[PDB]
Amino acid sequence: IDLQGQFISALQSLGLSHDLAKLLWLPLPMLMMLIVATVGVLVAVWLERKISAAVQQRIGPEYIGPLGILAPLADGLKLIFKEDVLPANSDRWLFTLGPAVVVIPVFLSYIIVPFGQNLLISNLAMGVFLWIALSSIAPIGLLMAGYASNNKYSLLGGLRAAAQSISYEIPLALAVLAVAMMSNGLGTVEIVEQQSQWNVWRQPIGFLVFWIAALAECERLPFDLPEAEEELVAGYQTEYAGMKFALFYLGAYVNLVLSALLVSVLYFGGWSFPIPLETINPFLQIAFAVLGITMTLIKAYFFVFLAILLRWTVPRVRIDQLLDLGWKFLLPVGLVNLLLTAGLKLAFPVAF
Amino acid sequence: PKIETRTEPMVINMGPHHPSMHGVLRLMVTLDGEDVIDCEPVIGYLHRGMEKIAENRTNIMFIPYVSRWDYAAGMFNEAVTVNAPEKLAGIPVPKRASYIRVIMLELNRIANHLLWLGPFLADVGAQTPFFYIFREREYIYDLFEAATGMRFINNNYFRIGGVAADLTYGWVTKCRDFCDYFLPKVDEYERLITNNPIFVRRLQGVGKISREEAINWGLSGPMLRASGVKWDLRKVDHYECYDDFDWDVPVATEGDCLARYIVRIQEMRESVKIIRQALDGLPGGPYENLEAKRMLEGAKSEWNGFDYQYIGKKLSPTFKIPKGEHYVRVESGKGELGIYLIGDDNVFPWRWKIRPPDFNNLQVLPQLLKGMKVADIVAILGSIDVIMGSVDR
Amino acid sequence: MLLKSTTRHVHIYAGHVVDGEVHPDTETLTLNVDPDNELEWNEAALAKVEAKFRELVANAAGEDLTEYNLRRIGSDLEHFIRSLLMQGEIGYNLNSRVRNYSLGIPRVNH
Amino acid sequence: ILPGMTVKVTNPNDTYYQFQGIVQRITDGKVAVLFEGGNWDKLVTFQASELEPVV
Amino acid sequence: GLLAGYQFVKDLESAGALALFVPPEGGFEGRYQRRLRSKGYTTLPMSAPGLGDLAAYLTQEHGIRPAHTGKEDIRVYFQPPLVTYHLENLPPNAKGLVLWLIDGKRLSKQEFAYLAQLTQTLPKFKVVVEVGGDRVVRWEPLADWVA
Amino acid sequence: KFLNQITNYAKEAVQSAKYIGQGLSVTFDHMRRRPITVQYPYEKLIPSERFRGRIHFEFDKCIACEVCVRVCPINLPVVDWVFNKELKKKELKHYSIDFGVCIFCANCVEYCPTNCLSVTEEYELATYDRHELNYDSVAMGRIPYKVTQDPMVTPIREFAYLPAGVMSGHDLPAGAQRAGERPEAIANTAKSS
Amino acid sequence: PAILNPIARPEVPQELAENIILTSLNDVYDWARLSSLWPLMYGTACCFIEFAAMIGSRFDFDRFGLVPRNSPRQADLIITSGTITMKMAPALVRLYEQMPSPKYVIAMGACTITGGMFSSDSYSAVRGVDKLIPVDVYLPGCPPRPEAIMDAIVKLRKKIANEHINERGNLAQTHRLFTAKHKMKPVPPILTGQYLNAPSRQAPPP
Ligand code: SF4
Ligand code: SF4
Ligand code: SF4
């Protein structure tokens, strides 16, 4: 229904300087994506907390609210209410700036996830490449948290956070190059409007590549070494007490949600009940919008579910067993996939 | 704020506050670039003074202390503290109370191996088996709470002349149900682990001792038996109700964490093979049939004789243990517990001593870390079934 | 590195508090009587504690700087505080915090 | 029911079914049965309706 | 409910002895204790499973005999009453001294009646008892709930 | 030399994926099995016929034998007597146990001849202060709790009190009994054929 | 010498608040810090094994919001679990004090509120953790039923609700501190590495 048009025209009817009107529509989706991001964090926390109890014949929170619905609310409000402590020789500027640096770009990368056509913020012609770029800023914040702490116990485990995050960006890049072949570019709308009746069937290998490189962004118990609670307590996090630890926590879960939404838009699509949709008009547009949003969230939820379900199925790996995936299983296979897709697009340019 | 790197080996502290279960233990470890040269293990954080408390406390007064050495299994040591003065006085023990002793003590062995298994896997990644053992090890808690009062530890079920209290009515067939429910699940663990590559690649060949190098250092338990040594005090010492059952003492030879794991996991099946074979042979069977057959005719019959009673003459708190020293021992999960008892003439002993297996087994922590890594330490430390409570003497 | 004796309401160190750090110097022996406010202190009894500490370090100490010795000093201070708290100079705080009677419950001295 | 009087339990919905025990104390309708048996003497409060004053 | 004023304080000042039927989670009752402290009342919970005759520990002076462990042969302490000592150690602007009991189920009818009758005598003193129960925090006078 | 390396590589990959999917299916199977959780405050668990919780005490049956102190590992219970002079009787003037020190070995219960001193199923002891655990003679009898008679509890039996073959104690008939016959029933059965 | 160990009779009493918009927000504040207590995995003895069984699936404590946390700084609670010898006590005060200020304590067991069985004839046990830190809830019993720990947490949760927001002045430390020069001849640390690299392990003497 082009809500931008009516918002600007109704607001341009009582004046308000039409350029200013186009300026004043900016913050609405820019904060709506923050709303759904925070909600996705709350949902991811509650989901992990209840499914990690289902796996174990356990029952998660039910005394917080009805079903633990208000558990991360309690967590966040507490961590606001907690004291913050700045240890003895730690720096004052870098300590309270590390978590901001590792948290910000994950939010900033929500300017590309569609949720529906013309239902996103500012489709960039670069798109996913900007995500691959902004994701490489996190190790700076992690090394900042390591250096800005007298805790050798922390820095010894903050360098290995800039060893895996600096290792699973190359195949993460190659698996999306393999999609940039097909889709005439890099914009998400172009990656997905190429699906009108999915890339997973034609990228059976790059799926594993992207999906192993996304889980291994210092997130999950298959690796999550920099928070290896048993190996060395909380790594770089153990001196962060109040809302700063909440920033780290938030950042992990919101990055997981972003990975799920991004696998959805890349390989499956944030539309397309798998029949060739649009074969069957504002009252119909508001229906297909809801349908596309719903199916997007279905696939994102399935990937969040599988991701949390590996956390309780897959014991961790030291650091050498880890880095012998990168450069020895993900990078050669990503190169092979790239060359394969290139050769097939050269021979069979149809279907790509 | 920073730390001023230098070309020297780094010293780090794995302090009392472990994020784990393996007691409270220091390991001042020095490394050469994510290696390990050696480490000074500063144990001592749990010395509360047993061996001098045991000199103003008679037997029945001291027996609840005894179950705090091995916090996991508080009957491999109640049994020893029973057997120590029991041999000097030469008090005959019946077959019923001794079969009960065998059953409960071997059930505690099962519990001990489960509590080894849990944190062994938590320190080596996932936490789910920690939740699958307290889903299963919690049933023998209910068994004990039925027979004795409290659960793992503090039962104080054993006594000098035998056993304190005859069993409950519905204990035996329910223990059979547990015995039958267990074997399908030690296999489900081996479905979830023992071939998962991310697990077995973590502890392929870390740690190793030769046969005769594991005998200087005296690694009395499965560590000594996980290096090619058929030796268990249940068989070589002819512990009380043995040679009456079938036997298959497990042995591995690699000496590494697999050689310990396979031994423990086969032992926790051989134990059930003993238990199922004991319940079918009691002097009296279940207490239901026993008491019924007694009251039916046996106010004098042979179903009220000494060998069918759960204890001989019940003693006073003035038993007055006789003179003469000796060393008793028992093969528990961690290995050989031992007590060097002396006695002079009175209720209070003279130099109560504990010889725990964990102490000698934990001597060789650093040799096993003779240049391995920083992150494969817990895999080795989790191999011994270290219980720092058993290092308070 | 530090060598401290941390009981309840007596914390002794071996450095000099500059602003909140400690900076072990090997000769300053700070003290931190009752940080958690289990007791309500006056100006006199607290000076008596101070003087006890001064005439307990200097008057009887000429041996090594182990934690054993500082722990012994802390024990003597924590018994001196019993004495002050029984005789009735100082008393418990009564505030709506924990109110756990670590030293003793109130008697009447019959 | 009154003190000092041995009783037994008539309640299939109770783990203490068909145990004989001596009454110890009675306050406010609920009576403390004492099960002299085994080794450790156990003490439990039952309602007067769950019981049966056996001889 | 999700928000409640100060009618609990009026009910308590009126009746003298209430009985809370809070849930077995202990998360939604301390706020009313706060509402009492927000007026001037001062609290002391002392966990009834541990109180004796309740005429010797509240009104009169009683003898506590601590734990000897072979050492330090039997000795008394004679702690003073719980209700004529804290009631005199009040601040100046003190409205009264409420009394909280966490586990009231373990006590009996007789001492419920005694605590109720003790509100009228010894004026600046009120009582509350957390007899666990209902899934919504409701209360009732303690003269009621008995006879 | 080189092809065999790639085949072994792919074989290791496939075996790893298979052994991961195995645990995947296992954990996805555990999330239909009913929770064995015991939702305690509303779904409390019933103690056994020998659990050792709080100690009981009668004032009328004691005769001041001092066995309780002479048998406790730490000589805990505070018996206080005065020996009135009618002929010989020790008059019991006070009796307490500090349950912040007591170990619940119940040897006290074991050697009391008068059946005065018993164990109760109270495991819900806790205070904001440890000088309240020192229970007096009139605060040790005190008529225990009896979990089942609680309007807001769904009691559960434990593994020794469930019918034969049964393992959990959650969704049970309202007539279940332990395992087998009592000896009285067996005797009256053998007597009647 | 008339009432020993006395109470102090305070003045300027507390100046509490009374408006509704603040006390409802106080209820939310307390509810939030209440229903998400994050313990510290602090184990020393079988009380920790009962705490581990409390983690388990026969009865968890994940509900009413408890996450076993590994570091003190993120934590909110030390369920003191085991005996406190005289060689680990500073390793407990340095865990308690090295933690954010709105923090609570539970003392499970009898070996850590009076020393329990080791309250007599022992020479290395601390006879009560209440003389190391401010215990907030006591529960007795060597190994207690771990569902009794949840009774203690119920009893602790109905004490977090008993707090007020304009009353955080009773939450800091006053630091009544001094200095004293001395002469006690410092000795070298004999506690280092050097367990196998020491010359005496690679050296049968003459
Ligand atoms: S053992 Fe029994 S009779 Fe003897 S003092 Fe104790 S309670 Fe009294
Ligand atoms: S349970 Fe043990 S410690 Fe407690 S009073 Fe009885 S004998 Fe003494
Ligand atoms: S109180 Fe009991 S369970 Fe706790 S450490 Fe002491 S003996 Fe072990």
Residue E136 CB-density burial (10 A; 0-12 exposed, 13-18 middle, 19+ buried):
exposed
Alpha-carbon span F134 to F140, nearest angstrom: 10
F45: CB partners within 8 A, 6+ apart: F38, F147, F155, F156, F158, G59, G147
Alpha-carbon span G52 to D33, nearest angstrom: 35
SS3 content of chain G, % helix, strand, coil (to 5): 30, 10, 60
Token duo for residue D54: 């056996």
Sheet of E100-101: strand order equals E17-20, E127-130, E100-101
Contact flag C108-E61 (C-beta cutoff 8 Å): yes
Alpha-carbon span E143 to B364, nearest angstrom: 70
Residue F119 CB less than 6 A away from ligand 2: no
F55, F57, F63, F102: which to mutate for ligand 1, most atoms within 8 A of CB?
Answer: F63
Q: How far, in Å, from the CA of B72 to the mean position of ligand 3?
A: 12
**Domain ranges, ordered by start, for chain F:** 34-50+145-179, 51-144
Residues of G comprising the binding site for [4Fe-4S] cluster? Answer: 46-47, 111, 142
* CB atoms near residue E3 (< 10 Å): 8
- What is the nearest CA distance from C50 to chain E, expressed in angstroms? 29
Do B and D touch (≥3 CB pairs < 8 Å)?
yes
Helix axes B95-122, B137-147, angle to 10 degrees: 150
Residues F94, E77: contact at Cβ < 8 Å?
Answer: no
Provide the 3-class DSSP secondary structure of residue E100.
strand
Q: From its phi and psi, is residue G100 left (phi > 0), alpha (psi between -120 and 50) or beta?
A: beta
Token duo for residue A131: 């995500």
Alpha-carbon span B290 to G113, nearest angstrom: 45
Residues A222, A6: contact at Cβ < 8 Å?
Answer: no
Residue G139 CB-density burial (10 A; 0-12 exposed, 13-18 middle, 19+ buried):
buried
Contact flag F180-B286 (C-beta cutoff 8 Å): yes
Residue F53 CB less than 6 A away from ligand 2: no
* Amino acid residing at A223: F
Residue F101 CB less than 6 A away from ligand 2: no
A75: CB partners within 8 A, 6+ apart: A45, A246, A249, G36, G65
**Domain ranges, ordered by start, for chain G:** 1-206
**CA nearest to F135, candidates F76, F63, F62, F60:** F76
Between strands D6-9 and D20-27, the pairing is antiparallel
- What is the nearest CA distance from G102 to chain A, expressed in angstroms? 7
Phi first, then psi: what are they for A13, rounded to 5°?
-80, -35
Token duo for residue B390: 């058993």
Residue length of chain G: 206
- What is the nearest CA distance from B171 to chain F, expressed in angstroms? 6
Alpha-carbon span B182 to B174, nearest angstrom: 12
Q: How far, in Å, from the CA of B347 to the mean position of ligand 3?
A: 25
- Partner residue facing F31 (CB), from A55, A314, A329: A55
Helix axes A98-108, A243-263, angle to 10 degrees: 30
Contact flag C107-E85 (C-beta cutoff 8 Å): no
Q: Which chain D residues are Cβ-neighbours of E108 within 8 angstroms?
A: 27-28
- Partner residue facing E102 (CB), from G12, G30, G155: G155
Alpha-carbon span A192 to A264, nearest angstrom: 9
User: H or E element: which one contains B340?
Assistant: strand B336-341
**CA nearest to E47, candidates G110, F126, G128:** F126
Strand partners, B163: B158
Provide the 3-class DSSP secondary structure of residue B31.
strand
**Distances from the Cα of A124 to the Cα of A178, A189, A243, A289, F43, angstroms:** 19, 9, 33, 21, 56
Q: Which chain F residues are Cβ-neighbours of C100 within 8 angstroms?
A: 128-130
Residues C84, C45: contact at Cβ < 8 Å?
Answer: yes
A311: CB partners within 8 A, 6+ apart: A48, A52, A220, A221, A222, B126
* CB atoms near residue A334 (< 10 Å): 26
What is chain G's alpha carbon radius of gyration, rounded to the nearest angstrom?
Answer: 22
* CB atoms near residue G8 (< 10 Å): 16
Alpha-carbon span B221 to B233, nearest angstrom: 10
Alpha-carbon span B278 to B179, nearest angstrom: 12
Task: Classify residue G22 by its DSSP letter.
Answer: H
**Residue F116 marked as a ligand binder:** no
Residues F126, E108: contact at Cβ < 8 Å?
Answer: no
Alpha-carbon span G57 to B130, nearest angstrom: 10
B330: CB partners within 8 A, 6+ apart: B76, B77, B79, B80, B83, B233, B239, B336, B337, B338
- Partner residue facing F132 (CB), from E23, E50, E132: E50
Tell the residue number behind the tokens 């530090």, with chain if given: C2
Residues E5, G20: contact at Cβ < 8 Å?
Answer: yes
Q: How far, in Å, from the CA of B52 to the mean position of ligand 2?
A: 21
Residues B272, B107: contact at Cβ < 8 Å?
Answer: no
What is chain F's alpha carbon radius of gyration, rounded to the nearest angstrom?
Answer: 28
Q: From its phi and psi, is residue G172 left (phi > 0), alpha (psi between -120 and 50) or beta?
A: beta
F57, F59, F117: which to mutate for ligand 1, most atoms within 8 A of CB?
Answer: F117
B376: CB partners within 8 A, 6+ apart: A318, B202, B203, B206
Provide the 3-class DSSP secondary structure of residue G201.
coil
Provide the 3-class DSSP secondary structure of residue G78.
strand
Alpha-carbon span G88 to E29, nearest angstrom: 38
G140: CB partners within 8 A, 6+ apart: F99, F100, F102, F125, F126, F133, G109, G110, G113
Alpha-carbon span G87 to C68, nearest angstrom: 11
Alpha-carbon span A159 to A235, nearest angstrom: 10
Q: Which chain D residues are Cβ-neighbours of F119 within 8 angstroms?
A: 40-43
Query: Sign of the C-alpha dihedral, residues B367, B373, B378, B379?
Result: negative
Alpha-carbon span B78 to B339, nearest angstrom: 11
Tell the residue number behind the tokens 């900076």, with chain if given: C23
Burial A93-123 (b: 16+ CB within 10 A, else e): ebbbbbbebbbbbbbebbbbbbbbbeebbee
Residue A343 CB-density burial (10 A; 0-12 exposed, 13-18 middle, 19+ buried):
exposed
Residue A197 CB-density burial (10 A; 0-12 exposed, 13-18 middle, 19+ buried):
exposed
Residue length of chain C: 110
Strand partners, G108: G81, G139
Helix axes A170-182, A330-347, angle to 10 degrees: 10
- What is the nearest CA distance from C90 to chain F, expressed in angstroms? 21
**HSE on the CB side for B112, CA within 13 Å?**
33
Provide the 3-class DSSP secondary structure of residue A21.
helix
Contact flag G57-F37 (C-beta cutoff 8 Å): yes
Q: Whose CA is nearest to atom 4 of ligand 1?
A: F65
Interface mutation vs chain G, best among E3, E38, E77, most G CBs within 10 Å: E38
A104: CB partners within 8 A, 6+ apart: none
Between strands C31-33 and G176-178, the pairing is antiparallel
Contact flag E30-G164 (C-beta cutoff 8 Å): no
Q: How many domains, in total, are found in chain A?
A: 1
Q: From its phi and psi, is residue G186 left (phi > 0), alpha (psi between -120 and 50) or beta?
A: beta
* Range of the structural domain that residue C104 is part of: 1-110
Q: How far, in Å, from the CA of B317 to the mean position of ligand 3?
A: 24
* Residue numbers of C between 77 and 106 with CB closer than 8 Å to F: 98-101, 105
Alpha-carbon span E88 to B11, nearest angstrom: 59
Task: Classify residue D51 by its DSSP letter.
Answer: E
Between strands E127-130 and E17-20, the pairing is parallel
Residue F109 CB less than 6 A away from ligand 1: no
Token duo for residue F86: 């009618």
Alpha-carbon span B340 to B327, nearest angstrom: 4
| Torsion angle of C-alpha atoms A289, A292, A293, A296, degrees rounded to 10 | -170
Residues A188, A111: contact at Cβ < 8 Å?
Answer: no
Alpha-carbon span D26 to G168, nearest angstrom: 48
Helices (H), ranges, chain B: 50-53, 59-66, 78-88, 95-122, 128-133, 137-147, 172-192, 197-200, 213-216, 222-225, 233-236, 257-279, 287-296, 357-363, 377-381
Does residue G105 sit at the F interface (CB-CB below 8 Å)? no
Provide the 3-class DSSP secondary structure of residue B171.
helix
All chains having 3 or more CB pairs closer than 8 angstroms to chain B = A, D, F, G
Residues G41, G5: contact at Cβ < 8 Å?
Answer: no
Alpha-carbon span A43 to A47, nearest angstrom: 6
Phi first, then psi: what are they for G10, rounded to 5°?
-70, 165
- What is the nearest CA distance from E90 to chain G, expressed in angstroms? 7
**CA nearest to E145, candidates E123, E127, E122, E124:** E127
G156: CB partners within 8 A, 6+ apart: E26, G37, G104, G106, G136, G137
Tell the residue number behind the tokens 């590996």, with chain if given: A310
Alpha-carbon span C93 to G10, nearest angstrom: 8
End-to-end CA distance of chain F: 81
**Distances from the Cα of D28 to the Cα of B353, E2, E147, F31, F142, angstroms:** 53, 37, 12, 47, 11
Residue F69 CB less than 6 A away from ligand 1: no
Alpha-carbon span A61 to A52, nearest angstrom: 11
Q: How far, in Å, from the CA of F83 to the mean position of ligand 1?
A: 15
**CA nearest to B381, candidates B166, B122, B130:** B122
Does residue G112 sit at the F interface (CB-CB below 8 Å)? no
Residue F117 CB less than 6 A away from ligand 2: no
Write the CATH number for B83: 1.10.645.10
Closest C-chain CA to G164: C96
Alpha-carbon span G115 to G122, nearest angstrom: 9
Task: Please give the number of the atom of ligand 2 that sits closest to the Cα of F52.
Answer: 1
| Torsion angle of C-alpha atoms A70, A72, A73, A77, degrees rounded to 10 | 150
Alpha-carbon span G52 to F121, nearest angstrom: 23
Alpha-carbon span G56 to G51, nearest angstrom: 9
Tell the residue number behind the tokens 């507390």, with chain if given: G14
Q: How far, in Å, from the CA of F49 to the mean position of ligand 3?
A: 23
* CB atoms near residue A226 (< 10 Å): 25
Provide the 3-class DSSP secondary structure of residue B341.
strand
Q: How far is C-alpha E110 from the geometric centre of its chain's CA atoms?
A: 15
Topology adopted by domain D1-55 = SH3 type barrels. (2.30.30)
**CA nearest to A121, candidates A198, A28, A183:** A28
Residue length of chain F: 193
Provide the 3-class DSSP secondary structure of residue A159.
coil
Residue F77 CB less than 6 A away from ligand 2: yes
Tell the residue number behind the tokens 């989790």, with chain if given: B382
Provide the 3-class DSSP secondary structure of residue B29.
strand
Q: How far, in Å, from the CA of A308 to the mean position of ligand 1?
A: 59
- Among all bound ligands, the one having the nearest atom to the CA of F76 is 2
- Partner residue facing A319 (CB), from B135, B201, B375: B375
Method used for this model? cryo-EM
Residue F65 CB less than 6 A away from ligand 1: yes
Alpha-carbon span A209 to A203, nearest angstrom: 10
Alpha-carbon span F149 to F147, nearest angstrom: 6
User: H or E element: which one contains A147?
Assistant: helix A138-147
Alpha-carbon span E63 to E74, nearest angstrom: 12
- Among all bound ligands, the one having the nearest atom to the CA of F105 is 2
Provide DSSP, D9-48: E--TTSSSTT-EEEEEEEETTEEEEEE--SSSPEEEEEEG
**CA nearest to B337, candidates B243, B234, B213, B225:** B234
Token duo for residue B280: 């079918």
- Structural resolution in Å: 3.3
Provide the 3-class DSSP secondary structure of residue A176.
helix
A83: CB partners within 8 A, 6+ apart: A241, A242, G100, G101, G102
Residues A296, A271: contact at Cβ < 8 Å?
Answer: yes
**CA nearest to B153, candidates B50, B73, B76:** B73
Do F and A touch (≥3 CB pairs < 8 Å)?
yes
Burial F21-34 (b: 16+ CB within 10 A, else e): eebbebbeebeeee
Token duo for residue C43: 């100006």
